[PDB]
Amino acid sequence: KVFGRCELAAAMKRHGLDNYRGYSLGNWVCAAKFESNFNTQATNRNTDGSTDYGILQINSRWWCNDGRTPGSRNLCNIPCSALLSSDITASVNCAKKIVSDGNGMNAWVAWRNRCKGTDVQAWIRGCRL
């Protein structure tokens, strides 16, 4: 499913991401934009054999099982496929564990290269929230 901007914002808020671990709603929306263009079905294979899945491009090396990432962990205890659903619940639940890990949203390369230090409030400006 391909979310619209405010739609996703609303969905993320509902799921508790606004200011989660101090990251305001517009960081999550910005990260989703550039990670997956808001497409729950996005997948990208990495050089190490791992794969990133879903709207927040969560990686199979640590967070989900895809049966093809040898020696990987499944810290969110979930099939990577769950992450591709049009219901963002699984991605959100897993994202909270990742941003709680230790380096916050820096875990999302697109986020620190394209969102961090920018006016991320602009991603929700306009939305009925």
Q: Is 101 annotated as a binding residue?
A: yes
- Taking the least distance from each CB to ligand [Kr], the nearer of 49 and 80 is 80
Binds Na ion by CB under 5 A, chosen from 40, 57, 59, 69: 69
Site string for ligand [Kr], 75-104 (x = CB under 6 A): -------------x--xx--x---------
The yes-or-no answer on residue 7 being catalytic is no
Contacts 24+ apart (CB under 8 A), 122-128: 122/26, 123/5, 123/9, 123/25, 123/26, 123/29, 123/30, 123/33, 124/5, 124/6, 124/9, 124/25, 124/26, 124/29, 126/5, 126/6, 127/5, 127/6, 127/9, 127/10, 128/6, 128/10
Can you give the binding site for Na ion, defined by CB under 5 A? Answer: 60, 65, 69, 72, 74
